[PDB]
């Protein structure tokens, strides 16, 4: 197994996949890693398996349609998975933990929304659909945007928005287009 965290690539207490060689620390994993469990499978080895139970999952999807599917316990994973993969690149620091705003030019939003709300959103089921999700990710960078304006600071927001999107399109296998 890997000595270090694969989120965070730290090491420190962590747990291993019992199949495939990735290791977590107990909150970098989502959902948090389970008190038992032997053997235990990280998401990326549970996702592998919903796509090799029923490959036609993997065929090209439309956006609007993944957005409306309601969040059973497939959904749900995926939609953990995706926070996931956003918190293992290293900027998503600056989107973790709430926000606040005092920029001379600025106002701050309406609704702010940051990666770790989302988390405990996610863990609490207040998500009927894969658009609440959705819609609360992209939030966090729009906010950004339009916050930060011309500074190149909101630099950072394209960047984590193009891992999201890039990872939405892989794991709810939206149709490729040009
Ligand atoms: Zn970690
Ligand atoms: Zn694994
Ligand atoms: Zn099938």
Redesign the pocket.
């Known amino acids: 197994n890997s000595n270090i965290?694969e989120?965070?690539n730290?090491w420190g207490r962590l747990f291993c996949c019992d199949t495939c060689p990735r290791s977590?620390?107990e909150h970098?994993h989502i959902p948090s890693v389970e008190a038992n469990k032997n053997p235990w499978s990280c998401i990326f080895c549970r996702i592998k398996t919903i796509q090799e139970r029923c490959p036609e999952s993997q065929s090209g999807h439309q956006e609007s349609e993944v957005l409306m599917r309601q969040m059973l316990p497939e959904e749900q994973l995926k939609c953990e998975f995706l926070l996931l993969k956003v918190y293992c690149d290293s900027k998503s620091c600056f989107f973790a933990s709430e926000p606040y705003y005092n920029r001379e030019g600025s106002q701050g939003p309406q609704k702010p929304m940051w990666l770790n709300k989302v988390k405990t959103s996610l863990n609490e089921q207040m998500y009927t659909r894969v658009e609440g999700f959705v819609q609360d990710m992209r939030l966090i960078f729009h906010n950004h945007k339009e916050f930060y304006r011309e500074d190149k600071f909101t630099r950072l927001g394209i960047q984590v928005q193009d891992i999201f999107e890039k990872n939405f399109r892989n794991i709810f296998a939206i149709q490729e287009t040009s």
Do not use: I, L, P
């Open positions: 965290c989120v965070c730290k977590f620390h970098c």
